[PDB]
Amino acid sequence: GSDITGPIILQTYRAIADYEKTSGSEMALSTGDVVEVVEKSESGWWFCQMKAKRGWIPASFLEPLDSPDETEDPEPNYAGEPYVAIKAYTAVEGDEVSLLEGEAVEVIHKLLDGWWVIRKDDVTGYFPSMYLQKSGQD
């Protein structure tokens, strides 16, 4: 059930909310359950395998069970980098932002919870990481 530390180098995480998929993919999450991440990305969607099956689960809803990594540790810099909206979406909440297909913006912080913080026309808010792409520097 629990051997000595060594050949065990997985990313264990613990959930804290009842998330039942969403679309024709992902995986079911029950508060208290642990997931052994197999693959991870920046889109905010994580790939983890459970005692049964694997899939995609929300990192935000997730909560490190003991993973020494404790998820990527970015730095919220007001400097940020310019990003261009690659998807059409309208703000549904005060925190979230509102952008169209091509409405550039200035990121203020990039997190693994998916919904990134984007300041469009001096309006920092929440907008999916994937919903926009990078387009700064040289």
Binding site: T22, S23, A59, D113
Partner: peptide, 25 residues
């Protein structure tokens, strides 16, 4: 049938839970 890598869902993950924010701990 390996065609590349594990593609991500077509819909972003739901916002974090209130219990998680109100209580970071």
């Amino acid at each position: 049938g390996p065609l590349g890598s594990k593609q991500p869902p077509s819909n972003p993950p739901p916002r974090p839970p209130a219990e998680a924010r109100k209580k970071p701990s």
